[PDB]
């Protein structure tokens, strides 16, 4: 009877820092997923402040099968483009901003592609 998957992430966020801080931007993702074999992907994109948007990081759980038991069981690769710093963190669901300059301020989006479908995405405006 069940078919598909559902996610929930509280789209709109607002984080304010100051130069030289060590904050960590974290999302609290909620999910209920069936049909175990999927391709989860958690992608952090960035836009300075607006139409264009850069790419900052992306974690991929490729061909995982842990459906309802905590998906951190199976681990995936977390290759991040080094044009930024931004030490990535657990499950790929949170960034860590180490020794931040002002230039990192901007609108960050965290889009979750589940099996090629954008199942949720949340905005967070980081500014001084």
């Amino acid at each position, epitope marked *: 009877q069940p078919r598909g998957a*559902e996610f*929930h992430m*509280w*789209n*709109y*966020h*607002s*984080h*304010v*820092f100051s130069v030289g801080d060590t*904050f*960590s*931007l*974290a999302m*609290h993702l*909620q*999910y*209920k997923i069936h049909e175990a074999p999927f391709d989860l992907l958690l992608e952090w994109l960035y836009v300075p402040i607006p139409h264009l948007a850069q790419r900052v990081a992306s974690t991929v759980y490729q061909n995982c099968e842990h459906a309802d038991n905590y998906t951190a069981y199976c681990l995936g690769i977390s290759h991040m483009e080094p044009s930024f710093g931004l030490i990535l963190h657990d499950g790929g669901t949170t960034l860590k901003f180490v020794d931040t300059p002002e230039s990192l301020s901007g609108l960050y989006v965290f889009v979750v592609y589940f099996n090629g479908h954008v199942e949720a995405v949340a905005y*967070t405006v980081v500014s001084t």
Partner: antibody
Amino acid sequence: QVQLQESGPGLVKPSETLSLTCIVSGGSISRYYWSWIRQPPGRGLEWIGNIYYTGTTNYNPSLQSRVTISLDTSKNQFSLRLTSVTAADTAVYYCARIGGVSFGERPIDYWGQGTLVTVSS
Amino acid sequence: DIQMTQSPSSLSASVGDRVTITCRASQTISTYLNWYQQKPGKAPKLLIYAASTLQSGVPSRFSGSGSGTDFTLTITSLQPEDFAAYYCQQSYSIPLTFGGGTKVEIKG
């Protein structure tokens, strides 16, 4: 089992800053959202904002231009700041918790006592 | 801003009667709303979460149901202790928004 207490002044002159502070006890700031809700003297209640354990504040955009929420994990508390208070901001202010770990669970389960903030001169 | 419409806004029922209130949303909020009860002078208590689940320590005469954009709270047998007001609140999308509220007065 956790309990929360508001510590704000009950009278604020118009156009000034309303500053409240909610102290939590009997529990942690661990992984929940910590929220503020207003209720006018006879009207229904409206959500003003909540804050996570690493900044990441969610504000009601109706008055996002005037409000800020700060965290004091070191002292296990969190404060609400509302600038340029008009006569319409007279309401009862509750501090509460939004939590739950499941799909359909994001409830305001544990509420505070609520303090009355009347604004006049 | 999701608009939440609550029905009715004021009702009077005798003791033991079956009370039913409806909550409607402008957008589909998947099993995402909570029913709260506010007694006069006191702070709201969580009655129902997940739109169908009972909070610990609440009598079983409170029953939540519905999904999509239509939800229903049912008090099976009214008691003289349930004079409070009742609200339905969504948590699907920021900003979180409450309902108008229903004044349940006891006519028994």
